[PDB]
């Protein structure tokens, strides 16, 4: 095993710098989080009065508490207390360094980070979103990008190192061009017919579908027999393609043979594999087949390695924890059911747990396993599975990705107005007006009801602004030519936006101001901030670069809209209309009635004694092709995946009560879809995007896209500054009292002493915990005083020794700033210790954050971490441009949601602090879903359309006459936002990895 030992040594060598950066940044952010909000999640709403905790609606967990003005409030009759009960199995808080580090690792991996984000904001405050933004961008996105680049550069180095019958036969080879076109049209229309198989289809519709299927089968069988007759058995069987045609046709007729229709219910849709026959005319489908083929044939070794890894981990987890799961099932199981839904007793569920980990959800299944088993076994297994599992999956993803895709006065006035508009004064005025109007849309919130002055101010501002933007566009018309206006792309965006605004104002001032199309137009006022794309050079360049790839994006989008249609049809065939359930809606929470009391739809009417039995359907299901697509997307983004996976498994037959794990093997459908419409349908898009970017960068000759000329000269100047080989030494003065200090400093031990001192300061700051003993607190305070005093002493010593030559070094200034910041924080804490009127602990905590400079001082002593930070600050301009675009998109969708969903029932996804009522809350929700985290939860409240989930007769809430939303707009909104923010973040990753590649 010496060869593999050396290989892993080299691999860790390539991973050494990235691993150290990850560990160091994680530790720094863990200390920051600990100090900023330690012992804060313990808060719980407690009865005012052997204590009682209120529970969040739809959940059994206690309702967490905040005390500040911006943190989570508490209902009437309850006062918030610091009860010594950490939330969520008491395994998630910042009460100590270990827990803070685990929470920060979870935030980095984004494994349900939505829950931690919500809890921390609810307890600490709404102004601490900055910490989460910083850890997501600097921590999560950035560190993930460096790990990806490291693997990509590890693989590249590995590659571098490496009679009548005869008459019929004569007539049987017509093979006219019309034949193939007719066959293609036939299959297309067959798929179209099979794509309208819904739940409540009339018997006439069912008969029509049966007739269509049988006649199409007859046509395909006739073509098969006619072709095979045209040749002999020795021929027409030498090709895997016609072999596959034979398999599909024989399966089609064999299924027809049986009178039980679909025995497995997949045979009915097995006839959809022939849709791959469009591959011949579609190179995109051809390359999709090629990537799958390379997955099975080219990288088969890697694929089987991944398979054996998953199988082994699942089997080990089963054999180790199944007995404990069975014995203690009552601890983690839901209140009503007896067994845990996601457990590890049997091999199937253990493999499902391992697959969920590889999908990126392990904290909940680690919590449950810790509760129902030894904590030492759990942590080792889950962490090992996650790190090793996710590493193998990404290694395979990049291996397939590279292996495949890499192998009269009129003229006078015209000129005068041209000169006028060309003026930078007018340009800046227009930019200012656009940026003012963009931000002026944040005040049209739900809470605007109580403030009438803001309404009048906004109305007058918009009325003047639209006229200012009609004048601006009329000055453009009279200045520039009509041809060049209506040929430029941006001039339209402005013309259509102003047209929308003008017709909206016209409808408002005339009648018909409350009609549905006019309201929809008003909803389109959220596009107003979009006018700023043209006036900013960075955003204009970024959007030009994006639009340069729209053709390829659409080409891949079609080939994944078909490959998902296959699965949508197959799912609608497997279970359509079988998701309905009979629930017990007591006050605000429910459980499906036990099979004993109720067994089917009719029983819900016979047993309707209490009037609390409702027969309702899962919000997202496979009733028709549209909802099949929606569920497919929910499973693809790995959000809302569990709920449907429960409804599908608990389903027997139309109009029958769901039963616990009646279909325990229906998880395989979702597993197979995840694999195929995930891994591969994303690999294809990522390959196409990286080829399009390469060809758009090489053809135009301009690299480092997403950057303007000023940013380019800055980027040129920063590169020169970073690589400055020559340096001017500092002469040694003759005076002995300074020569002796210079001799001491020059010795290669001052740096070592400072390094060990800062390391010990880090350890001392780490040792602190929550509710520590007073002796520990006092010794820590004295040690902090000692450390700050010695650092200030040495800094002033060397500053005086170097005279004015101290500031020549770039980072000596940073050292001086951190030292003086420590001194100021100490003297600002000492003065606060007195009366000083009134103060709050959070102020002390934030003031004590200045100690992190003494930790950041270790950067200058790093090996490659300084280089990585240099690359980050070198990419900073491009990332700034793309972030500006992303924030513009976020503003657009925040206004859309803030105008569309202010009246919705607060379900498990939307609560008091994460609604769309106000601009701040809208921004929190939009930032949360920018990672596609919790978007299913935010979508669920608006998928509801009737009782018991709503009260369409609820007073006010006239958006839909009630307090529930419209799926038609909700699905569009959320799907479009997630796709757009996925493309934009992919652009960010491309920028970062191309910069690091340099
Ligand atoms: C959902 C779809 C899942 C899998 C894709 C299967 C592709 C089937 C292609 C049938 C057409 C065929 O037969 O194509 C033969 C031709 C020419 O072949 P020839 O005449 O040169 O010899 O070549 C080709 O285009 C195909 C060559 C590449 C094969 C790619 C697929 C490899 C494995 C996929 C299936 C694995 C099991 C999945 C189970 C899920 C449940
Ligand atoms: C992929 C395409 C379609 C996948 C569809 C889902 C897989 C199961 C299909 C199916 O109906 O399979 C037959 C049964 C279904 O069992 P059940 O859901 O009724 O639950 C058990 C309840 N009891 C014990 C009372 C019978 O399962 C069994 O025989 C277990 C073995 C089924 C193997 C299915 C493999 C599918 C994966 C990819 C292609 C290979
Ligand atoms: C953005 C994200 C990350 C990227 C970081 C990139 C690094 C940027 C700073 C370092 C840098 O690029 O270098 C800037 C210059 C270097 O000058 P030079 O060598 O070119 O001059 C040569 C002069 N000749 C020619 C005379 C020899 O100057 C310096 O390094 C001085 C930098 C001064 C920084 C002061 C910051 C300290 C203040 C606050 C500390 C707060 C601690 C608490 C934290 C709370 C919890 C998080
Ligand atoms: C092939 C890829 C390799 C992948 C990594 C493999 C290496 C790591 C394996 C796992 C090692 C785990 C060691 C600890 C084992 C359990 C020890 C144990 O008894 O639990 C201790 C705690 C649980 O405390 P509690 O009951 O909640 O009580 C609260 C408080 N402590 C009290 O005193 O009342 O629970 C803990 O032990 C706290 C755990 C903190 C975790 C910190 C984050 C780690 C991030 C990820 C690291 C790996 C990367
Ligand atoms: C990358 C692109 C490809 C992969 C991603 C594709 C994702 C597609 C998701 C769209 C699903 C649409 C969907 O499910 O429609 C459903 C909506 C709402 O129906 P309803 O009136 O409540 O009636 C319920 C009944 N069961 C029914 O379906 O009738 O039916 C409606 O009445 C809405 C009509 C418009 C739907 C438009 C959906 C846009 C999806 C955009 C996805 C890509 C984003 C970019
Ligand atoms: C959130 O804010 C509330 C309101 O300020 C805090 O309530 C207060 O909590 C303190 C500490 O538990 C209570 O102090 C004790 O009061 C009793 C008398 O009732 C006294 O004998 C003890 O020596 C001690 O001073 C205080 O009474 C209580 N106030 C009320 C009105 O209940 C709450 O602690 C805060 N929660 C957090 C985690 O900050
Ligand atoms: C919903 O599911 C339940 C349970 O499967 C169905 O209950 C069954 O209903 C029939 C008709 O009322 C009952 O039949 C009668 O049972 C008595 C007692 O055995 C017998 O003396 C009569 O001759 C007759 O067979 C049947 O017993 C009952 N099931 C059980 C287990 O008692 C119900 O009909 C279903 N509803 C629908 C409309 O699907
Ligand atoms: C068991 O009995 C209760 C009580 O009669 C039934 O409640 C009723 O359920 C229907 C369907 O969910 C509700 O219909 C809706 O009412 C709202 C107005 O409240 C209306 O806007 C909707 O268009 C729709 O008609 C109905 O209101 C509700 N009645 C009450 C008093 O809550 C329940 O459906 C029964 N369960 C079964 C399985 O039959
Ligand atoms: C992509 C290519 C295929 C598109 C396939 C498009 O198929 C559209 C149909 O599924 C729509 O069915 P409906 O929503 O009209 O069914 C309603 C049924 N009830 C409510 C009357 C019972
Ligand atoms: C043909 C198939 C040959 C055998 C398997 C070929 C190799 O399949 C690898 C995939 O299963 C790995 O993906 P995961 O299962 O981790 O799912 C992650 C999906 N996202 C996160 C990318 C969407
Ligand atoms: C990474 C380092 C930065 C992390 C995010 C740091 C986020 O800090 C936000 C501060 O505004 C917290 O509030 P303060 O303590 O400044 O003021 C308290 C005022 N009230 C709330 C009591 C009225
Ligand atoms: C361009 C203009 C917008 C820049 C961006 C403004 O910030 C947008 C979001 O970060 C939300 O910021 P908030 O200030 O609403 O954060 C919550 C504060 N309260 C409401 C809790 C006090
Ligand atoms: C279904 O819901 C009803 C209504 O909640 C339950 O009936 C009673 O509801 C009250 C609360 O309104 C509880 O205090 C009682 O304990 C419930 N029990 C009964 C039978 O009166 C009903 O029990 C629920 N059924 C099931 C099987 O959960
Ligand atoms: C870094 C030096 C000082 C310590 C060396 C030991 C290593 C293993 C470190 C890493 C994680 C550390 C632990 C992290 C958090 C806690 C919980 C706290 O309530 C007491 C200290 C304690 C238990 C720490 C002790 C030291 C520790 C175990
Ligand atoms: C029908 C139920 C049991 C689900 C099983 C999966 C079905 C639908 C599909 C998925 C992938 C398919 C295979 C994909 C590729 C090929 C190669 C081709 O040359 C002959 C058909 C064959 C061998 C297919 C057989 C049927 C298949 C296994
Ligand atoms: C609200 C409605 C009425 C607005 C409609 C605006 C439409 C007509 C605009 C928006 C973007 C425009 C395109 C943007 C850029 C170009 C390239 C150039 O060759 C001129 C035509 C063409 C292709 C434009 C055609 C018209 C266009 C599609």
Numbering used by the authors: 232 to 280, 295 to 407, 651 to 895, 1136 to 1726
Give verbatim excerpts from the published study on this entry.
Voltage-gated sodium channels (NaVs) selectively permit diffusion of sodium ions across the cell membrane and, in excitable cells, are responsible for propagating action potentials. NaV1.8, one of the three tetrodotoxin-resistant NaVs, is distinguished from other isoforms by the relatively depolarized voltage-dependency of activation and inactivation, slower inactivation kinetics, and an increased persistent current; These attributes make NaV1.8 principally responsible for inward currents during the rising phase of the action potential, and contribute to hyperexcitability and repetitive firing in the dorsal root ganglion (DRG) neurons where it is primarily localized. Multiple studies have linked NaV1.8 to nociception and chronic pain. Here, we used mammalian HEK293 cells to express full-length human NaV1.8 and determined the structure, with and without ProTx-I bound, by single-particle cryoEM.
